[PDB]
C-alpha cells in the first residue's frame with residue numbers, strides 16, 4: 001500500500017495540488033481543512049483515499065496529533081491568517097516528531113530578506129524561515145520548498161499587485177514595483193506543485209534531507225511575462241513600473257503590510273525574490289534546475305496565459321475573451 005501523507009490547509013493551492021495527484025496514485029491522505037464548506041473542500045470530501053479533519057490549526061494540537069497518526073509523509077504549508085504562524089509551524093513539527101512514523105517532512109518555507117542585505121523582512125515570508133530553522137533543529141527528516149510567484153495571481157479584476165488590467169482599447173497593462181528586467185521565479189501551483197512534491201517524496205530523505213528546493217519552473221522578468229501574455233492573447237500587453245502598489249479593493253491588514261514590504265524590498269532595493277546564496281549567487285546552474293529535474297511536465301507562462309487565464313477570467317465574470 002502507498003504511504004499515508006498528512007497535509008494541512010488542504011484547500012490551499014499547494015496542498016490541493018499534491019492531494020489530487022497523490023490520492024490518484026493510491027496514497028491515503030489525512031488532511032486538515034478549516035471548513036468543509038466550499039468548492040475545493042467538497043471536491044476533496046469526494047476523494048476516497050482522503051480523510052478530512054475539520055477545525056482550526058491555531059492552538060489545536062489534538063487535531064495535529066490525530067492528523068499525523070499513521071502518517072508516513074507530510075507536506076506542511078502554513079499561512080499567516082490565524083495570527084500565530086510560527087507557533088502553529090512549531091506545533092505541527094513537534095506533533096510530526098511525536099508521531100514517530102514520519103519518514104519525510106516537507107515544509108513550504110520562504111526567505112527572511114533582512115538576513116541578506118539592508119532590507120526589511122517580508123511579513124508573510126520571514127516567519128516561515130523561522131519555522132524552517134526550528135524544523136531543522138528537531139532532526140526530523142525534512143526538505144524545504146520555496147514557492148515561486150503563482151501564475152494564478154494574475155487577474156483583470158482590481159486586486160493588488162498582479163492586475164493584468166484591460167484597457168478601453170482591448171490592450172492590457174500590468175503595473176507593479178518590480179524592476180521591468182529583473183527575472184522573477186514563477187510557479188503554476190495547481191498544475192506543477194503536486195507532481196513536484198510527489199517526486200521529492202519518491203526520491204526520499206536520502207536525496208533531499210536538509211535540502212532547500214526552489215519550486216519555480218520558469219523565471220521571467222515583468223516584461224517577459226507581458227510578452228508571454230501578449231503572444232498568448234494576440235493583444236499588446238505593457239508593463240509599467242510604479243513605486244507604490246495601488247489598493248483598489250478592501251484587503252486584510254496582513255496583505256496590506258505584505259505589499260508595503262514588497263515596495264521596499266523589490267521597488268526600492270531591487271533585491272532578489274530568493275536572496276539565499278544558493279538561489280541568488282550560485283543560482284540554483286539556474287534556479288529552475290532542481291524543479292525541472294523533479295517534474296518535466298511543467299506549464300509555462302505563455303501556455304497559462306493562453307489556456308488558463310481566459311477560462312479563469314470568464315469564470316470571474318469577465319467577457320473580453322468573448
Ligand SMILES: [Cl-]
Nearest residue numbers: 009011033034
Ligand atoms: Cl483549508
Ligand SMILES: [Cl-]
Nearest residue numbers: 171235236237
Ligand atoms: Cl496596440
Ligand SMILES: [Cl-]
Nearest residue numbers: 248249250251
Ligand atoms: Cl472592495
